[PDB]
Amino acid sequence: SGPCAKNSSIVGDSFKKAIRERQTVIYVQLRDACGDLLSTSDVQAFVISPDGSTVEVTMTPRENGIVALSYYPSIEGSYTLNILVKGTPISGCPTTMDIRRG
């Protein structure tokens, strides 16, 4: 039946914090309407930097409905993340990610 936005979510809260100029990975668990894990044309993910620019997000399909989202935050500050399943934000989206120089 494909992924269900309300049942799909980001794995953990590690995504809330990241380091500038380091390739960063966020894991998303896709679940159908029944809550079952899948098993990706229905999934969209974008990241906006603190100056309003789009950041390229790479999505790699993994086993049993996990999708790895990778991005490279070039500047410090408050990034915006949104992940849409069939045009609907998943649970917990859109959200903030704080990138530090650390």
Residue numbers in the entry: 691 to 729, 758 to 820
Q: What does the primary publication say about this deposited structure?
A:
LIN-41 belongs to the TRIM-NHL protein family. These proteins contain a TRIpartite Motif (TRIM) consisting of a RING finger domain (commonly endowing a protein with E3 ubiquitin ligase activity, for example), two B-Box motifs and a coiled-coil domain. Additionally, they also carry six so-called NHL repeats (named after NCL-1, HT2A and LIN-41) and may contain a filamin domain, which have been implicated in both protein-protein and protein-RNA interactions. To understand how this reprogramming is controlled, we searched for C. elegans mutants in which the activation of embryonic genome, a landmark event demarcating the switch from a germline- to embryo-specific transcription, is initiated precociously in germ cells. This screen identified a novel function for LIN-41, a member of the TRIM-NHL protein family, in preventing a premature onset of embryonic-like differentiation and teratoma formation in developing oocytes, thus ensuring a successful passage between generations.
